[PDB]
């Protein structure tokens, strides 16, 4: 039922969603698109509902599809310019979701309360596993489509820029302490928006094969250097190049992900080696020499 | 915790030196209480109490006390008061605004946002709750205080401050759990040995707490277990106990609880309590010649300090319990070696009339352990009998008879069950 | 021009001025204002919120500030009575307010 | 000790407070910092009495216990033209529909 028509409050709601995120996508927004969003969600909700709300998250995904094609239609493109495009995607939608949710927070509470993960796994609607039919807020869907947004331009140029930035462009500007700082910070920064996997994309997206090829390769390094490095000393050039990887990774941090590659090749290079080394241990005991024996220590 | 209580009155106090002894809330508490069954010495007890309301000024209790004051004053006026109540109200507003002072302080210190600042906030909060005699939200801080203690000294802080609270908080279950904790639980040996053979034993305060516990809890065994444990080197707590009351309290909980051997060990070989020992020469030689059995004057001063244990707020609530088990174990003491209880000289000792004597005994009959009987014309018992073997015989046959009884019962029960038998509802 | 104050405004420009200190509890003042948040306002009033209703809604925010300052739950904090009308429209206002 | 206060121009409300010892000139400089009118451009009222600038809120008779969240003491906020008196009118807040029997015991 006796309440009111509840399927006539989602038609115009979706229209405002498309005329906001995509309207001022990337650039700012302004109070015009503020209340455009607000009346957007109010029409998605004031229908005067129940049927507006489901159609409300409908037009939600629809016009967020809009505002984030403002942040994704420019991904079939060329070199790191689009890496910086993904950068700006994130960066624009920072203030985007900022003012969007700040002017939209009540509807954010409103149109989500049927199908989302935090409220709904199996009880009265699903967000726990899947329906292909969620119901969730503005930063929620933000990260949701974002990870899927983290594929087309990513696979396109960001993977290749990763590629052309982890062995042999050490010189000049790499990359410098903001390039793979930001890139690997992306890997950790796309961890679960439910916070379930606060580190999965770092082992997974950045941290393991760096231990892989940095260990294998750095053993290549210690090999050739022992070819041509005057061992006096071998331990000492070891200390040199290992610190090389330490500061090379003090540009790309990416924290913890790759280094937790750092633990991974030292045990390769002095745990598949010891014999001549621990022999070099009673020599300095026999012929001193604080530096060499110390580095032995 | 006031028991009605009759008189009723004993003139055997000295309250000036009591307030010298005790202090704070409990000071005026017992002042009031004693004054109640101590009229006309009620007078000065309550006078000095209300002047103690002139001390940190819980003037709600001022209200109550001068209420009683004018009550008993007019009641006095049969026999034959003048007070500065308005200036009291002025200083009352003074106090309340000082409350507000420290409240503003409190919220400032909330704003300080420091865990140790948090802790001292709890501290001083409960402090002034103590000060003006209204205490409630203080507990919250200490109810909150445990959330700010991690380290060993933090354990020290939580425990000693929760229980120093309990000095006037005065609540066993949780605070006894924390006595157990703070003595044992955190950092076993407490990481400090309770001050490593605690110089000032707050263990002593723990002891006082649990002792009042098994006062009310009445499990006075561990009570005396702690009472013996008196460690003088704590040396100071006006709310702890008067050493008169300290020793009398403890040792008489024991004198209820004990069996004579370990307690003489506890008593004759008491060392840690020896100062506490040497406190009351009265109660000292009381229990001495008690175990030496001069029952007459022992019981004499026993029910002479009747009135003054009454004069204890806390000895009052168990006077019957105490004197009960006292004369019980007086029996238990002397009677055990004999074979036929003569009364004549013995009654001359216990100072119970011949009938009252034998009816004490008749009581004894109600529970007593000796298979004993009396020629009343003997005026003398003969105590317990000899055989237990034949006793076993009779219990044996009683056994067998009820065995066969049950056995037929269960035969017939197998019948009734297996014969479908029951009773319908209608 | 942040000092402090935001302006929650009702009906025909009946402006309730809410201290920044309370405003931020709506986190809403702190965040809602942004698009251009950077301006030195501390000045926001309502343009539709009835005044007697809006008054209670913002009084809740003040009450929350007081409660917070108090910290220890209640130091002469009264019972937050709410008479009652509901509801029909208040639902939508409440939804927009979204505590 | 803050009397909770509404320093109101006609349709305008400074939702604020101040302890009883706060003088009116102090709060007027405060509202100056708030919306940029100095005490010579502001006038505090105890809803009828232009609160003298040296008058503290207790001196203004204000009691915080009465000047509260759901019941703050109302502060007349005139915008000083030193020749005139703004004469604060408490503009009545909007009204919803009638209290239903639905909320009544019926």
Curated annotation (Swiss-Prot), chain A:
Location(s) in or outside the cell: Nucleus
Record's comment on post-translational modification: Neddylated; which enhances the ubiquitination activity of ECS (Elongin BC-CUL2/5-SOCS-box protein) E3 ubiquitin-protein ligase complexes. Neddylation leads to structural rearrangment in the complex that allows interaction between the E2 ubiquitin-conjugating enzyme and the acceptor ubiquitin. CBC(VHL) complex formation seems to promote neddylation. Deneddylated via its interaction with the COP9 signalosome (CSN) complex.
Signal peptide extent: none
SUBUNIT field: Component of multiple Cul2-RING (CRL2) E3 ubiquitin-protein ligase complexes consisting of CUL2, Elongin BC (ELOB and ELOC), RBX1 and a variable substrate-specific adapter; this complex is also known as ECS (Elongin BC-CUL2/5-SOCS-box protein) complex and may consist of CUL2 or CUL5. Component of a ECS(VHL) or CBC(VHL) complex containing CUL2, RBX1, ELOB, ELOC and VHL. Component of the ECS(MED8) complex with the probable substrate recognition component MED8.
Family: Belongs to the cullin family.
Domain topic, free-text comment: The Cullin neddylation domain restrains the RING domain of RBX1 in the E3 ubiquitin-protein ligase complex; this restraint is removed upon neddylation of the cullin.
Function statement: Core component of multiple cullin-RING-based ECS (ElonginB/C-CUL2/5-SOCS-box protein) E3 ubiquitin-protein ligase complexes, which mediate the ubiquitination of target proteins. CUL2 serves as a rigid scaffold in the complex and may contribute to catalysis through positioning of the substrate and the E2 ubiquitin-conjugating enzyme. The E3 ubiquitin-protein ligase activity of the complex is dependent on the neddylation of the cullin subunit and is inhibited by the association of the deneddylated cullin subunit with TIP120A/CAND1.
The protein's name in its UniProt record: Cullin-2
Provenance organism: Homo sapiens (Human)
The encoding gene: CUL2
Curated annotation (Swiss-Prot), chain B:
Keyword Translocase: no
Domain PCI: 226-388
Top-level taxon of origin: Eukaryota
Subcellular location: Cytoplasm; Nucleus
Main location: cytoplasm
Gene Ontology MF term list: GTPase inhibitor activity
Gene Ontology BP term (one): regulation of protein neddylation
GO cellular component: COP9 signalosome; cytoplasm; cytosol; nucleoplasm; nucleus
Tissues expressed in: Widely expressed.
Entry keywords, A to Z: Cytoplasm, Nucleus, Phosphoprotein, Signalosome
Location of Phosphoserine modifications: 425
NAD keyword on record: no
Pfam families in the cross-refs: CSN1_C, PCI, RPN7
SMART domains: PINT (SM00088)
Functional summary from the UniProt entry: Essential component of the COP9 signalosome complex (CSN), a complex involved in various cellular and developmental processes. The CSN complex is an essential regulator of the ubiquitin (Ubl) conjugation pathway by mediating the deneddylation of the cullin subunits of SCF-type E3 ligase complexes, leading to decrease the Ubl ligase activity of SCF-type complexes such as SCF, CSA or DDB2. The complex is also involved in phosphorylation of p53/TP53, c-jun/JUN, IkappaBalpha/NFKBIA, ITPK1 and IRF8/ICSBP, possibly via its association with CK2 and PKD kinases.
Family (UniProt): Belongs to the CSN1 family.
Comment on protein domains: The PCI domain is necessary and sufficient for the interactions with other CSN subunits of the complex. Mediates the interaction with CAPN8. The N-terminal part (1-216), which is not required for deneddylating activity and CSN complex formation, is nevertheless essential for other aspects of CSN complex function, such as repression of c-fos/FOS expression.
Complex formation: Component of the CSN complex, composed of COPS1/GPS1, COPS2, COPS3, COPS4, COPS5, COPS6, COPS7 (COPS7A or COPS7B), COPS8 and COPS9 isoform 1. In the complex, it probably interacts directly with COPS2, COPS3, COPS4 and COPS5. Interacts directly with inositol kinase ITPK1. Interacts with CAPN8. Interacts with USP48. Interacts with ASB4; this interaction negatively regulates GPS1.
Protein name: COP9 signalosome complex subunit 1
Annotated organism of origin: Homo sapiens (Human)
Swiss-Prot record, chain D:
Residues bearing the modification Phosphothreonine: 84
InterPro entries for this protein: ELOB, Ubiquitin-like_dom, Ubiquitin-like_domsf
Record-level GO cellular component terms: Cul2-RING ubiquitin ligase complex; Cul5-RING ubiquitin ligase complex; cytosol; elongin complex; nucleoplasm; VCB complex
Subcellular localization: Nucleus
GO MF: transcription corepressor binding; ubiquitin protein ligase binding
Keyword annotations: Acetylation, Host-virus interaction, Nucleus, Phosphoprotein, Transcription, Transcription regulation, Ubl conjugation pathway
Main subcellular localisation: nucleus
Residues with the N-acetylmethionine modification: 1
Domain of life per record: Eukaryota
Keyword Transcription regulation: yes
Ranges where the Ubiquitin-like domain occurs: 1-66
Pathway(s) per entry: Protein modification; protein ubiquitination
Record text on subunit structure and interactions: Heterotrimer of an A (ELOA, ELOA2 or ELOA3P), ELOB and ELOC subunit. The elongin BC complex interacts with EPOP; leading to recruit the elongin BC complex to Polycomb group (PcG) target genes, thereby restricting excessive activity of the PRC2/EED-EZH2 complex.
Family indicated by similarity: Belongs to the Elongin B family.
PANTHER family in alphabetical order: ELONGIN B, TRANSCRIPTION ELONGATION FACTOR B POLYPEPTIDE 2
Function: SIII, also known as elongin, is a general transcription elongation factor that increases the RNA polymerase II transcription elongation past template-encoded arresting sites. Subunit A is transcriptionally active and its transcription activity is strongly enhanced by binding to the dimeric complex of the SIII regulatory subunits B and C (elongin BC complex).
The protein, known as: Elongin-B
Organism: Homo sapiens
The encoding gene: ELOB
């Amino acid at each position: 039922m006796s309440l009111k028509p509840r399927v006539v409050d989602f038609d115009e709601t979706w229209n405002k969603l498309l005329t906001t995120i995509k309207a001022v996508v990337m650039l700012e927004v302004e109070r015009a698109t503020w209340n455009d969003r607000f009346s957007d969600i109010y029409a998605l909700c004031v229908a005067y509902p129940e049927p507006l709300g489901e159609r409300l998250y409908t037009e939600t995904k629809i016009f967020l599809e809009n505002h984030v094609r403002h942040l994704h239609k420019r991904v079939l493109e060329s070199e790191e310019q689009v890496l910086v495009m993904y950068h700006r995607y994130w960066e624009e939608y920072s203030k985007g979701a900022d003012y969007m949710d700040c002017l939209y927070r009540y509807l954010n509470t409103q149109f989500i309360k049927k199908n989302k993960l935090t409220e709904a796994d199996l009880q009265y609607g699903y967000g726990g596993v899947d329906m292909n039919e969620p119901l969730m807020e503005i930063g929620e869907l933000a990260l949701d489509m974002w990870r899927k947004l983290m594929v087309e331009p990513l696979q396109a140029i960001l993977i290749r820029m990763l590629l052309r930035e982890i062995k042999n462009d050490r010189g000049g500007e790499d990359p410098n302490q903001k390039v793979i700082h930001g890139v690997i910070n992306s890997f950790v920064h796309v961890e679960q928006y439910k916070k379930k996997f606060p580190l999965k994309f770092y082992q997974e997206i950045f941290e393991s094969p760096f231990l892989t090829e940095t260990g294998e390769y750095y053993k290549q390094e210690a090999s050739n250097l022992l070819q041509e490095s005057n061992c006096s000393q071998y331990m000492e050039k070891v200390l040199g190049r290992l610190k090389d990887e330490e500061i090379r990774c003090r540009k790309y941090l990416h924290p913890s992900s790759y280094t937790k590659v750092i633990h991974e090749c030292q045990q390769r290079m002095v745990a598949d080696h010891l014999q001549f080394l621990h022999a070099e241990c009673h020599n300095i005991i026999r012929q001193e020499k604080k530096n060499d024996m110390a580095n032995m220590y | 915790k006031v028991y009605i209580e009759k008189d009723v009155e004993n003139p055997s106090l000295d309250l000036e030196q009591y307030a010298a002894s005790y202090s704070g809330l409990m000071r005026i508490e017992r002042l009031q209480f004693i004054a109640d069954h101590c009229p006309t010495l009620r007078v000065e007890a309550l006078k000095m109490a209300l002047s103690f309301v002139q001390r940190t000024f819980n003037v709600d209790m001022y209200e109550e006390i001068h209420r009683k004051l004018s009550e008993a004053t007019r009641e006095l006026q049969n026999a034959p008061p003048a007070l500065d109540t308005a200036w009291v109200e002025a200083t009352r507003k003074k106090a309340l605004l000082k409350l507000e002072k420290l409240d503003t302080d409190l919220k400032n210190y909330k704003g300080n946002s420091i865990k140790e600042s948090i802790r001292r906030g709890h501290d001083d909060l409960g402090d002034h709750y103590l000060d003006c005699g209204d205490l409630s939200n203080a507990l919250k801080c200490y109810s909150r205080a445990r959330d700010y203690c991690t380290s060993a000294k933090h354990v020290i802080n939580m425990c000693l401050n929760v229980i120093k609270v309990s000095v006037y908080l005065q609540n066993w279950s949780h605070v006894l759990s924390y006595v157990s904790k703070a003595e044992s639980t955190p950092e076993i040996a407490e990481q400090r040995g309770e001050r490593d053979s605690q110089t000032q034993a707050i263990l002593t305060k723990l002891k006082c707490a649990a002792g009042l516990a098994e006062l009310a809890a009445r499990k006075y065994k561990q009570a005396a277990k702690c009472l013996l444990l008196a460690s003088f080197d704590h040396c100071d707590f006006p709310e702890l106990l008067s050493p008169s009351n300290v020793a009398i309290y403890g040792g008489l909980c024991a004198l209820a609880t004990f069996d004579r051997q370990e307690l003489q060990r506890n008593v004759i070989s008491s060392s840690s309590f020896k100062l506490f020992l040497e406190l009351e020469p009265q109660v000292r030689d009381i229990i001495f010649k008690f175990y030496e059995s001069k029952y007459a004057s022992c019981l004499k001063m026993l029910d002479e300090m009747k009135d003054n244990l009454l004069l204890d707020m806390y000895l009052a609530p168990h006077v019957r319990t105490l004197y009960t088990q006292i004369r019980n174990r007086a029996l238990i003491q002397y009677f055990s070696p004999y074979v036929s209880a003569d009364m004549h000289r013995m009654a001359a000792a216990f100072n119970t009339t011949v009938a009252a004597l034998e009816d004490e005994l008749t009581q004894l009959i109600l529970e007593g352990l000796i298979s004993a009987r009396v020629d009343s014309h003997s005026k003398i018992l003969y105590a317990r009998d000899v055989d237990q073997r034949s006793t076993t015989f009779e219990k044996s046959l009683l056994m067998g008879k009820e065995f066969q009884r049950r056995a037929k019962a269960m035969m017939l029960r197998a019948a009734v069950l297996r014969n479908q038998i029951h009773v319908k509802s209608p | 021009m942040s000092q402090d104050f935001v302006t929650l405004v009702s009906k025909d420009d009946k402006e309730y001025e809410i201290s920044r200190s309370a405003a931020m509890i709506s986190p809403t003042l702190k965040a809602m204002i942004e698009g251009p948040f950077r301006e030195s306002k501390g000045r926001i009033e309502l343009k539709q919120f009835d005044s007697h209703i809006l008054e209670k809604a913002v009084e809740y925010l003040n009450y929350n500030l007081k409660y917070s300052g108090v910290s220890e739950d209640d130091d002469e904090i009264p019972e937050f009575e709410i008479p009652t009308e509901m509801s029909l429209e208040l639902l939508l206002a409440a939804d927009y307010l979204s505590i | 000790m803050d009397v909770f206060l509404m320093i109101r121009r006609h349709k305008t409300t400074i939702f604020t407070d101040a302890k009883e010892s706060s003088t009116v000139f102090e709060l007027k400089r405060i509202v100056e910092g708030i919306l940029k009118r100095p005490p010579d451009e502001q006038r505090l009222y105890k809803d009828d009495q232009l609160l003298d600038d040296g008058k503290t809120l207790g001196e203004c008779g204000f009691t915080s216990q009465t000047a509260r969240p759901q019941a703050p003491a109302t502060v007349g906020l005139a915008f000083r033209a030193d020749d005139t008196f703004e004469a604060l009118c408490i503009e009545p807040f909007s009204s919803p529909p009638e209290l239903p029997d639905v909320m009544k015991p019926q």
